[PDB]
């Protein structure tokens with residue numbers, strides 16, 4: 001048997017503190033290759049350990065292809081190979097485009113579907129999984145208008161999360177770290193912020209909000225842990241719901257849903273399954 005392992009790295013589509021993502025080519029087909037910095041080796045090990053435990057396969061989860069470790073003269077090279085989504089991240093997409101009602105709902109219900117799949121334990125199956133870094137940059141847009149969730153480098157099975165998206169109990173260090181349900185409730189908080197980011201870009205009555213990240217109006221770029229703690233925990237601020245949403249039945253329902261992801265009390269927040277059911281009854 002010939003085992004063709006050569007991947008041609010064609011163009012860099014992402015670079016950050018902790019590595020690069022490349023569009024690559026295997027056997028005439030696009031793949032995405034994440035090349036890890038030595039600084040973020042544990043994200044490669046955690047995602048690899050998870051996929052070695054359960055081969056996740058879901059339309060709303062970025063599709064796994066391979067984990068590769070290659071010996072170099074003085075270092076180890078770590079690659080994660082996945083499906084390639086040419087339309088890029090939701091974060092990217094929402095700057096380039098406004099949404100109609102159908103596309104808005106298809107995006108958010110697809111994200112909820114992916115997240116409920118991660119969260120649910122299946123017997124016979126998969127362990128329950130919490131993501132721990134859900135945000136619009138870790139969601140990819142597919143050609144069919146659904147999204148998929150990426151980056152299980154911080155996932156837990158039953159590095160810290162992006163500070164802008166941290167739930168109040170992470171910022172005030174009251175999270176029950178010995179309780180798996182705590183980590184689901186942190187993802188639900190983050191989901192509510194993503195829902196807000198998407199809903200802003202849905203047109204109603206000729207009106208749309210510009211793309212902004214959550215808390216854009218109350219914290220700096222690269223907010224500190226303390227910046228976020230004072231907004232979210234001490235002052236208990238939440239993202240603004242513009243008046244124009246209350247003229248639109250879809251955005252009225254989505255505002256109620258995002259409120260039920262943002263309760264200070266983590267156990268009051270909706271579950272991913274309840275969010276899907278609610279979204280299927282909207283419109």
Ligand SMILES: COc1cc(-c2cncc(-c3ccc(C4CCN(C)CC4)cc3)c2C)cc(OC)c1OC
Nearest residue numbers: 001002003004005006007026031065066067068081
């Ligand atoms: C090692 O490394 C890489 C390998 C590959 C790759 C290339 N051709 C063929 C294969 C293949 C798959 C499966 C079998 C099975 C057949 C059924 N039998 C009962 C057991 C064995 C054999 C061969 C693979 C896995 C691609 C890669 O990159 C995309 C690799 O690098 C990450």
Ligand SMILES: COc1cc(-c2cncc(-c3ccc(C4CCN(C)CC4)cc3)c2C)cc(OC)c1OC
Nearest residue numbers: 003004026027029030031064065066067081082083
């Ligand atoms: C890693 O990823 C890719 C891999 C391959 C690929 C290459 N050679 C062989 C295979 C294979 C053949 C046969 C079995 C057997 C296993 C048990 N039983 C006997 C029935 C089925 C398994 C595996 C595959 C899956 C192709 C891909 O794309 C077309 C891959 O995606 C990039």
Ligand SMILES: COc1cc(-c2cncc(-c3ccc(C4CCN(C)CC4)cc3)c2C)cc(OC)c1OC
Nearest residue numbers: 013021032033034080082084085088089138150151
């Ligand atoms: C978040 O996390 C991961 C994401 C990916 C991933 C998968 N498909 C497509 C992409 C992508 C492509 C293209 C753009 C832009 C830039 C170029 N311009 C043309 C506009 C579009 C953005 C993004 C990525 C970044 C893979 C990963 O691992 C292999 C990730 O990590 C787990």
